[PDB]
Every structure is written in structure tokens, then in C-alpha cells.
Amino acid sequence: TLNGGITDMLTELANFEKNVSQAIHKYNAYRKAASVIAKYPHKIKSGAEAKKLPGVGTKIAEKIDEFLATGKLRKLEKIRQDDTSSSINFLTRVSGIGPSAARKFVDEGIKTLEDLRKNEDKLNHHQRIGLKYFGDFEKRIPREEMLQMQDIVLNEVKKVDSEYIATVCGSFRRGAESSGDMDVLLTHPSFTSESTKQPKLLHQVVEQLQKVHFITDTLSKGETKFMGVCQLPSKNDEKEYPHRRIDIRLIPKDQYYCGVLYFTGSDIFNKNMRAHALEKGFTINEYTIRPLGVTGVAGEPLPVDSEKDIFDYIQWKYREPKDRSE
DNA sequence: CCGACCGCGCATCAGC
DNA sequence: GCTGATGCGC
DNA sequence: GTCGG
Ligand SMILES: Nc1nc2c(ncn2[C@H]2C[C@H](O)[C@@H](COP(=O)(O)OP(=O)(O)[C@H](F)P(=O)(O)O)O2)c(=O)[nH]1
Ligand SMILES: [Cl-]
Ligand SMILES: [Cl-]
Ligand SMILES: [Cl-]
Ligand SMILES: [Cl-]
Ligand SMILES: [Cl-]
Ligand SMILES: [Mg+2]
Ligand code: NA
Ligand code: NA
Ligand code: NA
């Protein structure tokens, strides 16, 4: 937070471009800038100093001067004053409601928490659950609770089949003292890039977790990706914990490393690394790293036996999880 | 300039 | 039913 | 909104 004022401003701007303007590239532009600046080990003294960093162009440079000078940005002040932008921004905070749905709702006169509640009829399943736990999903999860959640998940998975391997990724794997949710990578020997010898692999796990009342709701669920809600069990007479978002990703056992690299993130770190890969002539997804041919087409998967091998391919020194928080 | 900006699973819809 | 595009999210 | 060729 050495330059918290600036990164917050930029993040607010990114959110604006994304939710209201629906200008995803501008959104990422602001995010990257915010990211490179949050990483800057100095208290920025001017937009010019900031422009030296890659990702900070002329536009952001001027805004940083305005911010440093007056402690604010007129562009944002006006944005906050605009009722439609504010309503749209607010609705996009409900899981399941994106820029389009948000603007649509606002067009229908549905602009507040109260409006959503008296209009469940107009929401799809995901949006419905997102509204239900609106407040809870806003809360952070202390690492202490992430540790309790981890323990339940690994043990419950073990009970279903001893060969399952569940790895908690996301900010948790990066050493964060608090996480926005829980991310679980799952593998089983019977499921490889080569074949699927057992059906319902992800289902059995989800099922077991619902059985012990850890998983409470489902936002979306497929053969390899579960997106839902969970809650730690509370003791007698004590207030129950907030409900939490949980994502479970089943990846081919032989593609673990690409999978854990992907799920560990951060999201921006992934974007930068994938972008660098391309420049180096490779393409990286959660399953493999493949070279790009002369035609610019993905070739066959390259051999990977550790997260480091992926880093070596694109000529990047290895970065531990804790240093990938961009 | 000007195009590139990561890559993909699930839910939903239109069009057949 | 299917396929493909879109929205949304990670 | 920013960057590289
Ligand atoms: N390539 C790519 N990868 C993405 C993207 N979004 C999320 N990811 C990856 C990396 C996250 O760590 C991981 C989990 O997604 P996440 O949204 O839970 O992020 P996270 O790192 O856990 C956050 F810090 P928190 O949840 O604690 O607030 O999913 C994306 O847009 N592109
Ligand atoms: Cl854009
Ligand atoms: Cl401001
Ligand atoms: Cl791998
Ligand atoms: Cl692949
Ligand atoms: Cl680490
Ligand atoms: Mg997470
Ligand atoms: Na710059
Ligand atoms: Na949302
Ligand atoms: Na998540």
C-alpha cells in the first residue's frame, strides 16, 4: 500500500471500463498499471516517475499527477456521481451478474439490493445464489479458516478414494494471509490426457462434500469444473461462519504441473506469463505448453515434470508461488 | 501508425 | 436434439 | 490505454 492511493484509483478506473464501458482492453490496461505500480518499491512522486514503468503510458501518467496534486481524480468523481454507472457497477458485484446483465437490469428499473430481492423471478440460478450470499462473498477468509477448510476437503476426498490428490491453490498456495475464496485442484490416476477410466470422478467428490454439509450450494457443475458454495461447521452456541465461494478443478493427472501453475495464479501473473510465452514462441494453457510453428499454430505438448520446466521453456527464472502475486 | 492484448469450462440462447 | 456464439467466471 | 516493430 506504499502507493495505495494510486493503485486504488487505477483499480476503480479498471472496474469502470469493464463494468460500464465494456472496454475489456482498457480494463486490463488499468489493471496492469495498477499491478506494476503496487510492485514498485518506492513512493511515487510524479506521473513521470511512474511512466518509466511498463504499462504506465501518457494517460495514466497525467492522472497520477492529478491524484498526487489534489488527492483525487475528477473523472472518477463524476463517475461516482452518475447514477447509471453506479447502479451498473454495484450490480456487477453480485456473482452471476456481469456488465451486460447489469446494464439490462438497470434498464428494467432494477438498480438496488432491494430491487434484486423482490425480483428473484428474473434471475438465473447462479445470480440467485450470488444474491443470497451477497454479503458473505464480500468477506475475506483468514488463512486460519483456509487451513480448517483445507483439512476438511483433503480428508473428505481421501475418504472417497485414497488415490485422489487435492491441492489448494489460488492465493492460499501463494502464502496469502487471507483469501477471497478457496480453489481446489483435483487429480485421480484414472483420469489422464490419455483416457478417462472412471466416470463421475468430480461428482463423487462434490457429492461427499455435500453429504458432510461442507458444500451448501452449486453455481455451476460439469465433468471437470465445480463452482459453488461451502461453509465451515460451527460449534454449539457460536455464530456460524460466513458462506464461502469454492471452485474445484479436475485436471488430468499427467498434466498436474500446468494445472497447478494455472490454478496458483495470480490471474494477472498468468496473463503476463502466457503473453511472454507467446513472444517466446509457445502457448500455455492449464493442460500443457506447446510451441508455435512457423504458421503460428500450436504444436504437440512439450514434456513437463515440474513447474520449473515451464518457466525454463520461456526462459524465465523460476518464481516461487509467493512471488506470483501480481 | 496499428494491431495485439491468455486461454478456457459451464450456462444459456438462437437457429437449425 | 445438435452446434456455435455469447455471457460470465476462474 | 499501452506497447512493439
Ligand atoms: N489464465 C488465467 N488464469 C486465471 C484467470 N482468472 C483466474 N485465474 C487463475 C489464477 C488464480 O490464482 C486462480 C484462482 O482464481 P481466483 O479468482 O480465486 O484468484 P486467486 O488468486 O485465488 C485470488 F487472489 P482470491 O480468490 O484469493 O481473491 O485461477 C484468468 O483470467 N486467466
Ligand atoms: Cl477496450
Ligand atoms: Cl478519486
Ligand atoms: Cl504438466
Ligand atoms: Cl492442450
Ligand atoms: Cl511460495
Ligand atoms: Mg481464489
Ligand atoms: Na511506461
Ligand atoms: Na458479478
Ligand atoms: Na476461485
Side-chain angles (χ1 to χ4, degrees), chain A residues 1-113 115-238 240-293 295-326:
Chain A
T1 66
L2 190 60
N3 291 291
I6 294 173
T7 57
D8 285 338
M9 169 192 74
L10 292 172
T11 290
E12 206 178 316
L13 283 173
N15 291 334
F16 172 76
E17 294 304 336
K18 183 177 178 300
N19 308 319
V20 184
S21 300
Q22 303 189 300
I24 185 65
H25 299 302
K26 290 195 175 192
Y27 157 69
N28 282 310
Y30 279 120
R31 306 171 78 195
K32 168 180 288 181
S35 183
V36 72
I37 288 180
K39 184 169 58 183
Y40 195 58
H42 298 301
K43 180 167 171 182
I44 296 178
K45 305 166 192 164
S46 76
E49 177 184 348
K51 195 174 181 306
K52 293 176 167 303
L53 307 182
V56 182
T58 307
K59 288 281 197 176
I60 292 176
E62 269 176 52
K63 289 182 171 59
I64 289 176
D65 285 325
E66 194 185 321
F67 188 67
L68 287 173
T70 66
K72 61 185 187 59
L73 198 64
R74 289 161 293 162
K75 179 183 177 66
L76 282 181
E77 291 294 298
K78 175 181 180 180
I79 288 177
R80 297 194 185 84
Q81 289 163 282
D82 185 67
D83 295 312
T84 303
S85 297
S86 297
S87 290
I88 290 174
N89 267 318
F90 171 66
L91 297 179
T92 64
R93 293 169 60 186
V94 176
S95 184
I97 301 180
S100 187
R103 182 175 288 279
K104 184 169 179 296
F105 285 132
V106 181
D107 291 341
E108 302 184 65
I110 307 178
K111 311 174 180 179
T112 75
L113 189 53
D115 303 324
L116 289 178
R117 284 176 174 166
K118 64 186 176 191
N119 278 287
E120 298 201 21
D121 49 299
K122 295 190 176 60
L123 301 179
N124 62 28
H125 185 60
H126 184 154
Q127 297 170 323
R128 192 175 301 246
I129 304 300
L131 172 66
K132 182 185 179 177
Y133 301 116
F134 179 74
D136 279 352
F137 294 173
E138 286 281 301
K139 304 187 175 70
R140 304 281 305 177
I141 311 177
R143 190 187 183 79
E144 184 191 303
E145 279 177 48
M146 289 293 275
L147 284 177
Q148 290 171 261
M149 291 158 81
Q150 178 176 230
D151 183 70
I152 289 175
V153 167
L154 277 61
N155 277 291
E156 288 309 316
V157 163
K158 186 185 297 182
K159 293 173 193 176
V160 181
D161 193 316
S162 76
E163 295 200 301
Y164 275 118
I165 294 186
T167 306
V168 181
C169 303
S171 63
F172 178 79
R173 181 154 190 275
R174 297 202 303 275
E177 287 305 305
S178 78
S179 296
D181 66 24
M182 171 171 263
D183 302 300
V184 190
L185 178 68
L186 188 68
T187 68
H188 189 285
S190 68
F191 174 49
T192 66
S193 62
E194 187 53 52
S195 65
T196 300
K197 303 189 172 189
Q198 304 199 314
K200 298 185 279 188
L201 274 180
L202 177 56
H203 189 78
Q204 280 187 292
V205 170
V206 172
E207 204 163 65
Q208 178 63 23
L209 291 179
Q210 293 171 316
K211 180 185 186 299
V212 301
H213 303 296
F214 180 69
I215 283 187
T216 59
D217 307 77
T218 294
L219 305 184
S220 60
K221 174 175 174 297
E223 309 268 63
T224 64
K225 186 168 71 66
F226 175 76
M227 184 178 302
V229 187
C230 63
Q231 168 185 52
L232 285 173
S234 62
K235 294 186 174 189
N236 282 325
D237 280 7
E238 87 187 22
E240 52 185 68
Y241 290 99
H243 279 71
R244 316 291 197 184
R245 276 273 296 103
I246 180 172
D247 295 313
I248 305 175
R249 185 65 187 267
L250 172 60
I251 292 185
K253 177 88 171 197
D254 56 299
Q255 293 178 162
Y256 170 75
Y257 297 116
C258 282
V260 75
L261 166 59
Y262 152 75
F263 228 23
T264 297
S266 68
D267 57 335
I268 289 180
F269 167 82
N270 287 356
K271 290 172 75 293
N272 299 316
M273 195 182 177
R274 291 180 182 193
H276 179 72
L278 292 173
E279 292 166 51
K280 285 297 183 174
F282 305 73
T283 174
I284 302 174
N285 58 25
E286 60 265 54
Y287 311 117
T288 53
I289 176 166
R290 311 183 178 197
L292 287 181
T295 170
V297 173
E300 297 283 295
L302 298 176
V304 166
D305 284 77
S306 68
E307 291 180 70
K308 190 172 188 293
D309 290 333
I310 311 179
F311 280 80
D312 291 321
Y313 278 121
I314 66 181
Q315 284 143 50
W316 253 19
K317 291 183 180 181
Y318 184 62
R319 290 170 61 179
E320 287 299 324
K322 67 182 185 63
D323 293 307
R324 307 176 195 167
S325 287
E326 310 191 304

